[PDB]
Symmetry: C2
Subunit: 99 residues, 2 copies
């Protein structure tokens, strides 16, 4: 029932998704991450796009997975004061891409 353990699990979900143990996923959520946790969640993407709509950001992070395979992570969030991020959704998608 712990919030830290909860954020650690979310980070692990993303890790497992990038490993392709979780092939694809989506989760609806309402939890507030410290910058350190948010950075841990997203890692080092090869590409990113960030779009703001009505006070909410949806970022799309792309990770080169394998030769034609790409992993894409969408994180929907609200930016809070003291550099906190209220995450509302996370979605992981596979895509075939030209090498």
């Amino acid at each position: 029932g712990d919030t830290h353990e909860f954020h650690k699990l979310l980070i692990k979900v993303v890790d497992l998704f990038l490993e392709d143990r979780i092939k694809e996923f989506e989760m609806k959520l309402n939890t507030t991450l410290d910058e350190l946790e948010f950075e841990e969640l997203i890692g080092k993407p090869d590409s990113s796009n960030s779009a703001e709509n009505n006070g909410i950001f949806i970022d799309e992070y792309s990770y080169d997975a394998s030769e034609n395979a790409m992993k894409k992570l969408f994180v929907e969030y609200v930016r809070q004061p003291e550099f906190k991020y209220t995450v509302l959704s996370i979605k992981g998608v596979n895509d075939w891409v030209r090498e």
Copy 2:
């Protein structure tokens, strides 16, 4: 590893039933043993099971209130030795009234 991975899937369902994860889906290809599959689903108030072309979808209901419930869908292929290849897990919120 795989035992740790299966422990996480079980905990994802747990967090979903607690409503920390409001709703979710995961696409998967992993084989749970009988004990893991039992622990994953926990203690539903009712269950439904359907089969189409050798693929099973079980639907589990967990009552929250008079009107609200959590539903878990698990799609899987039964394997020898009481093992189950899970292909997707989906947690949704449902209500009695429109």
